[PDB]
Amino acid sequence: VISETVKSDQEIIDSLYRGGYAYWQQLRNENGTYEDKLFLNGDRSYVGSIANSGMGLIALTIGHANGWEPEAEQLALVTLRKLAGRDPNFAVPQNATNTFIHFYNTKTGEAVGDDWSPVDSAIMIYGALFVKNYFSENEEIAELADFLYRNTDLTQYIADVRTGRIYLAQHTDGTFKKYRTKAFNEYMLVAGIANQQAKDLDNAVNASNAKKFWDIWYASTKFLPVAEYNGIPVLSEGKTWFTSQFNFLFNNYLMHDFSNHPEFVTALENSAKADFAFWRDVDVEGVELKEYEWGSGAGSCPNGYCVDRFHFDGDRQFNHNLVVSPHILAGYIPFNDRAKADLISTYRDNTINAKHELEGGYEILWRYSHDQPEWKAEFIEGVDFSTFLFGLAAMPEHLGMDFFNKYNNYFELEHHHHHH
Ligand SMILES: [Cl-]
């Protein structure tokens, strides 16, 4: 255990906060694309993620605000021009409905995989709109953001209003894959854009249904499914399982419709209480978690890539390597009283492989396994890692959650809900 004499709580938080931004600085390519994964050894696969352009745009504002990225406005422009197809070296692939491919080659632009992804498209668009707000005097950033927002219609992904279903993905030719996904989850991101587009796009495919969908499932929490963890109500896709915790965090940091809505904020707080309670209920032979260890996330694991979820009464069947996620714990810091202290404790614990150093000596925390304590991650997926910086940045004495609730307000002016 690292003593408070060797390193103070403040020194730890300062290191991790700067480290969380250096991550993004390293994930970013000069051409304004972002790798899917950061390799801790300095390797680069040149496999990019569209989602990480959105998260990286957000991160640029955080670095800027902290004095760590004085070029940020121009880095944001480079990324947005690249996303808009305005760099002649290559464009990111889009399918027959202008949906972006999830992954692509960051040297050549070749598509990678089969996932023409509305959600990853939506994360990119949010990041564009976030930098538009942040660099609000740059007209070219506004124009590019508006172009990206208007040119992928997400109203088409609303599948069935009465059951809360959105199509997961499209095929190359623009038809939908079979799979539908139900509220509550991170497809709130999709719904939100579709709700705005219904108002804003002249030719929205499916405007009325997108509005109706939003009004039932996401204008309030009233109709969302609830699954109870030890009597704690947790929004979910149904009553007998839990969705991913990152869904609450992505929706909160990226969408005003979540972060500015007290029902949704309360839901995120409850969800974090359930994740803590879960980790305290785990009783696996040969494992002993300390009290400060918790957070159910997605990301690299001994099995490759894992989407870890909690389940009733400490049941770890949906957490295949019994991985604990410090990016999720960090993400909770503004929303749970003990998360910050627990993140620090986690850093101090030398029996777990949570600490990682980046090139340049920067420090972060990341996923580690209780089934395989000697495992140490070799890379970090940006979409998941996002919430580490965001949670640290949203500390009250850092930028605060009001930073995100201000700059994620894409669709309203400041006095919208005030007296005229
Ligand atoms: Cl991704």
Author numbering: 9 to 428
What does the paper say about this structure?
β‐1,2‐Glucans are natural glucose polymers produced by bacteria and play important physiological roles, including as symbiotic or pathogenic factors and in osmoregulation. Glycoside hydrolase (GH) families related to β‐1,2‐glucan metabolism (GH144, GH162, and GH189) have recently been created by identification of two β‐1,2‐glucanases and a β‐1,2‐glucanotransferase, respectively. Structural analysis of the proteins in Groups 1–4 revealed that they possess (α/α)6‐barrel folds similar to those of GH144, GH162, and GH189 enzymes. Overall, phylogenetic, biochemical, and structural analyses revealed that Groups 1–3 are new GH families, GH192, GH193, and GH194, respectively, and that the three families belong to clan GH‐S (clan GH, classification based on structural similarity) as GH144 and GH162.
In this study, we used PgSGL1, PgSGL2 from Photobacterium gaetbulicola and EeSGL1 from Endozoicomonas elysicola as Group 1 proteins; SkSGL from Sanguibacter keddieii, a Gram‐positive bacterium, as a Group 2 protein; PgSGL3 and PgSGL4 from P. gaetbulicola as Groups 3 and 4 proteins, respectively. Groups 1 and 3 contained proteins from many marine bacteria, for example, isolated from marine sediment and mudflat environments. Because hydrolytic activities toward β‐1,2‐glucans were detected for PgSGL1, PgSGL2, PgSGL3, EeSGL1, SkSGLc, and XcSGL, the general properties of these enzymes were investigated using β‐1,2‐glucan alditols (see Section 4 for details) as substrates. While many of the enzymes showed optimal pH values around neutral pH, the optimal pH values of PgSGL3 and XcSGL were 8.5 and 5.0, respectively, which suggests that the optimal pH value varied within the SGL clan. PgSGL1 and PgSGL3, single‐domain enzymes, were eluted at the time corresponding to 42 kDa, while the elution time of SkSGLc corresponded to 140 kDa. These results indicated that PgSGL1 and PgSGL3 were monomeric enzymes and SkSGL was a dimeric enzyme. Interestingly, PgSGL3 (Group 3) produced Sop8 predominantly in the initial stage of the reaction, and then Sop8 was further hydrolyzed (left). When Sop8 was used as a substrate, Sop8 was hydrolyzed to Sop3–5 (right). The five enzymes (Groups 1–3) were clearly identified as SGLs.
